[PDB]
């Protein structure tokens, strides 16, 4: 098995230009906010499985590895909002995250704000990052709760720490609720999936950078004339499912004697990870499924919005 | 009576290839998830009485017998979700299950998440398995609650422990609620009942492996030309009712002098366990009921879905 | 009695060349229509009791037995139009027939067309067959309603599924109503009854194939020099009455000790099934009725048209 | 069989100059209407089976293939009016056609006009095309309903989108009902069938372009001195029946060993598709039928008007 090759095949990262555009903007946000005056407050979108958490873990690596190895400073922070977040609920988890506090046996929402606003200059927080903004909409109706939104405006105007919010593409109507939240968050971006399969894409260079990143030491055989056809036939532009199927083929090749990912084990990888796909999506690998041109069609605009049509 | 023969007739297990396919996939999931990076998160389906609980008890036997006899490690865990599960309700029972905690006199849902995420690396949990996913749909309407779903995504992204969910076939629309839950659960399988009676089935080999597994030391007389006809006439493909009727015949044969299951006591076993069957299902054993070809017809696709049509 | 012999005497089928000509044309229509472009849309005629329903049940046997035993595909469909069919009335019964829908508590005729045109590629309908086209003419006048005709053109041009219409010979003036229906239905055939008695007919071979098909294991005595004379004297060319009288003799022979259909029990069969015949038709079997040559005269052209003269 | 040759023999298109005259006029109508001021509103006629639907599918190919592959724009639209169209009935189907709406559970005819007039600039409709205008006349009487006509004038004057109406030649009296509809539709054309067989016709070049379009790789033998005689004897000028008989011969030649359509299999094609023809039409192919000069007579003016004489 040689589990080093397995973990080294799973932990692989390809920097598409949108990702480095993002990380450049967050360093821009980090040492552009001067902690004297009003911050910049970027907002990042992206659908399910487009690489968001990988982006922020890249960011806390390249921004906080040496400063977390040096001492208890914690300049950048990483937060997910729990579902249907009460303002005291999000505030207390954001508080027990940073520092070494006890911090949550009292739930009073004024005095823990006191403790968090005295601690946010005490350890020297350079940036606060929130992962999951779509948790503030109701399940069965599309009312949105902005107790946490006005609380986040309060902690923004209290201490001038920059905030970078990630979230689903349907989570922006929450920002359409509070207009002061809408104006305070100026930079919204678009981390949409891979666009086309027609040729000379960013998809190409991503694919062959992943190919040299793979643990097989000669060639992976991928990013070819017909392979990206069935690859884009399998995953829409969907980064998580593409990488998942690729990893599930790579483990199958390293289970036995195999020199590269080839045409006997990539099929069984299509057999496993075909579960999340819809019924009208077509299964292209086993016996005779040639792929029409309409099925490599680019992803629509409401690609991170199908959590929202039904209600 | 000789109760050893009774318990040894009840506890009998036949490994059909779908079961070993499952258990191979869960060892694949166990030492494929590296506990560094993102897990694999299999999902298992199956209707009522298709052998699910027997599969997981086989699994905790073959995976945790020696490690539970060695010390307090508890690498694999077994959980059922209680009905209409609150997120704190499922979390506290999942917490009192593992370790030796007190764990449930406080119901605060942030600090018990704290305790569970510090304990899930402390004892070294290799796998968490949930039995009953269909308990998250409402009785009278088909609203589904995904407080527990977003909480399970939270505990998935917090600590990278693999999760194997079992459940009813109509319970997958719950996974259709949250698209991030849908994408995070890639491997969905199909544990459907026995398909046909026409000949050269998996049903055959299952039947005669059960026949050699029976406590009668010469031959059970089953898996014959006409016996599987009335067997598939009694149980649809339904593993629980087939095994139940077989056990109820075996006890009747060992109650008195009988050398094998035969044509006087298998009838009284059809007399007892005919209660759960529908009205239009035909009762084939007593006096003259010859079985038409249409009544050995394979089970439909909505065979684990008749909890769902009426509302 | 031995009811196997009774059902095996009733369910007997003789393939005259017009029937196999038909079934060849409907397989021609099935895999000639490519479901990309414009279909072929055969029309079949035939008077009362000429074997139409038996032909289509033969067809769904030989075309859909294995595919209906395999799963829920339903490639070929079987429809009768109810009398004075409203377009929503025919559409809703054609809808509840295929698939497993609820489908008829709403009667809106635009949204059920929506459901039927999304379902006709969803299950993969290869062919739609309609039995009763003569139900679209008014009783007391010969106005014909073509709401259903233009609706059938609409569903024909919407999805390109081939349609095979059966019906009475006077039902073709309905197709003379809409000229686009007239041009879209190109292949009209003629399933007329048996032509003559005079010798070397198709009637001969049909008769002795029925004779070997009968449950009597030596000879039926039929298709002889004088027996087909009184047979064609009884039934005009009328398949239903000929087969009905033959079956009513065969049951009378198997009621008691009889070795073949003979000249004591075939008479009582003429006594029973002489009711539907006209007054000027002559009753030839009992005491002395020798049959003239003019009474074996071939059937006229308006043999499926006597529902139409009076108004 | 080689189904590629079958579909490639069915999908063949010959551009007679009237068709390219039409398509030139609809591009003229598309980018002559400026969407600022009053549109041009062409009207197209033609009898049954003269190639209308093929013309518009050619048009949406050559006008909307790349723009439908690019994104959700849908510049040109394709509509058939259902039979006896209510204004809300035609409006709701024209609405669910374009865009991705729900659109038809409310039938209120003022608010769906609101939605359609805000959506017709939202997606950027360049052209609306209606197939079936003859559905607005009553069956049994020649009253015509112009609720849909005044509604179409309303949507024409509301947003200035050009409209191209196809329809039967007897459907123009509907346009004679509303004089404002009559004046708003200026360009009416004449897509009549093929005129003569006497020599040097457009029929000639059409016939040999179809001959080189056929799947037989040497010569089809057609468009000769005597073959177009019996061809025009079979089909009047009728494009659908001519192409249908030609296709039914081509399949018969490719069923067995045959090198071209010849004089044994073209006859059986005349045997099949002779059903839609009238009684006084003469059947010319089998044994000795030489064709008089009067039977190649040009089609009359009321050739798309025989749906209209009887009432
Ligand atoms: N740049 C990249 N190069 C290689 N693999 C990547 C890259 N980005 C993402 N992936 C893969 O995609 C998978 C999904 O990552 P991630 O969870 O960050 O997406 P996401 O949009 O955050 O999904 P979710 O929002 O549901 O958490 C990861 O397992 C990772 O291996
Ligand atoms: N492989 C097998 N060999 C022999 N017997 C089996 C096998 N699988 C299941 N059974 C029998 O079927 C019965 C039902 O088992 P089980 O409860 O696991 O099914 P289930 O689908 O989990 O039902 P439920 O979901 O309602 O608990 C058991 O009593 C067991 O004896
Ligand atoms: N080929 C055949 N061989 C033997 N019997 C036949 C054959 N065709 C028809 N019959 C007999 O004729 C009887 C009438 O059949 P059927 O109802 O199909 O005729 P039909 O024209 O459809 O009458 P209707 O239109 O009134 O239903 C059947 O009971 C059947 O037994
Ligand atoms: N230019 C052409 N070249 C070759 N074949 C053609 C051409 N035009 C039409 N056809 C053939 O004629 C047949 C009838 O086409 P179409 O339905 O468009 O006529 P139509 O007048 O629209 O009939 P309807 O109005 O009843 O739909 C088609 O199957 C097509 O194959």
PDB file of N, CA and C in Angstrom, chain D residues 91 94-95 98 111-121 151 155 158-159:
ATOM      1  N   UNK D  91     -51.120  31.397 -24.395  1.00  0.00           N
ATOM      2  CA  UNK D  91     -50.137  32.221 -23.706  1.00  0.00           C
ATOM      3  C   UNK D  91     -49.328  31.410 -22.704  1.00  0.00           C
ATOM      4  N   UNK D  94     -46.832  29.140 -24.608  1.00  0.00           N
ATOM      5  CA  UNK D  94     -45.773  29.993 -25.124  1.00  0.00           C
ATOM      6  C   UNK D  94     -44.856  30.464 -24.005  1.00  0.00           C
ATOM      7  N   UNK D  95     -45.384  30.555 -22.783  1.00  0.00           N
ATOM      8  CA  UNK D  95     -44.578  30.942 -21.634  1.00  0.00           C
ATOM      9  C   UNK D  95     -43.738  29.798 -21.072  1.00  0.00           C
ATOM     10  N   UNK D  98     -40.458  29.113 -23.434  1.00  0.00           N
ATOM     11  CA  UNK D  98     -39.263  29.920 -23.259  1.00  0.00           C
ATOM     12  C   UNK D  98     -38.860  29.996 -21.795  1.00  0.00           C
ATOM     13  N   UNK D 111     -51.701  38.455 -15.372  1.00  0.00           N
ATOM     14  CA  UNK D 111     -50.407  38.392 -14.707  1.00  0.00           C
ATOM     15  C   UNK D 111     -49.417  37.502 -15.445  1.00  0.00           C
ATOM     16  N   UNK D 112     -49.888  36.537 -16.226  1.00  0.00           N
ATOM     17  CA  UNK D 112     -48.923  35.812 -17.031  1.00  0.00           C
ATOM     18  C   UNK D 112     -48.520  36.613 -18.252  1.00  0.00           C
ATOM     19  N   UNK D 113     -49.388  37.516 -18.709  1.00  0.00           N
ATOM     20  CA  UNK D 113     -48.972  38.489 -19.709  1.00  0.00           C
ATOM     21  C   UNK D 113     -47.926  39.434 -19.145  1.00  0.00           C
ATOM     22  N   UNK D 114     -48.092  39.831 -17.877  1.00  0.00           N
ATOM     23  CA  UNK D 114     -47.083  40.590 -17.145  1.00  0.00           C
ATOM     24  C   UNK D 114     -45.752  39.855 -17.122  1.00  0.00           C
ATOM     25  N   UNK D 115     -45.761  38.577 -16.731  1.00  0.00           N
ATOM     26  CA  UNK D 115     -44.515  37.818 -16.699  1.00  0.00           C
ATOM     27  C   UNK D 115     -43.915  37.628 -18.087  1.00  0.00           C
ATOM     28  N   UNK D 116     -44.747  37.440 -19.109  1.00  0.00           N
ATOM     29  CA  UNK D 116     -44.183  37.198 -20.426  1.00  0.00           C
ATOM     30  C   UNK D 116     -43.645  38.482 -21.041  1.00  0.00           C
ATOM     31  N   UNK D 117     -44.267  39.630 -20.756  1.00  0.00           N
ATOM     32  CA  UNK D 117     -43.734  40.873 -21.287  1.00  0.00           C
ATOM     33  C   UNK D 117     -42.559  41.388 -20.476  1.00  0.00           C
ATOM     34  N   UNK D 118     -42.315  40.881 -19.261  1.00  0.00           N
ATOM     35  CA  UNK D 118     -41.050  41.267 -18.642  1.00  0.00           C
ATOM     36  C   UNK D 118     -39.951  40.290 -19.031  1.00  0.00           C
ATOM     37  N   UNK D 119     -40.318  39.066 -19.413  1.00  0.00           N
ATOM     38  CA  UNK D 119     -39.308  38.084 -19.784  1.00  0.00           C
ATOM     39  C   UNK D 119     -38.861  38.181 -21.233  1.00  0.00           C
ATOM     40  N   UNK D 120     -39.723  38.642 -22.134  1.00  0.00           N
ATOM     41  CA  UNK D 120     -39.360  38.792 -23.544  1.00  0.00           C
ATOM     42  C   UNK D 120     -38.258  39.831 -23.804  1.00  0.00           C
ATOM     43  N   UNK D 121     -38.006  40.857 -22.967  1.00  0.00           N
ATOM     44  CA  UNK D 121     -36.701  41.532 -23.064  1.00  0.00           C
ATOM     45  C   UNK D 121     -35.630  40.958 -22.154  1.00  0.00           C
ATOM     46  N   UNK D 151     -55.255  39.072 -28.707  1.00  0.00           N
ATOM     47  CA  UNK D 151     -54.189  38.920 -27.726  1.00  0.00           C
ATOM     48  C   UNK D 151     -52.817  38.983 -28.383  1.00  0.00           C
ATOM     49  N   UNK D 155     -49.797  41.606 -27.605  1.00  0.00           N
ATOM     50  CA  UNK D 155     -48.404  41.317 -27.292  1.00  0.00           C
ATOM     51  C   UNK D 155     -47.492  41.843 -28.392  1.00  0.00           C
ATOM     52  N   UNK D 158     -47.338  45.629 -27.438  1.00  0.00           N
ATOM     53  CA  UNK D 158     -46.716  45.828 -26.136  1.00  0.00           C
ATOM     54  C   UNK D 158     -45.198  45.823 -26.251  1.00  0.00           C
ATOM     55  N   UNK D 159     -44.630  44.698 -26.671  1.00  0.00           N
ATOM     56  CA  UNK D 159     -43.222  44.591 -27.023  1.00  0.00           C
ATOM     57  C   UNK D 159     -43.091  44.272 -28.501  1.00  0.00           C
TER      58      UNK D 159
END
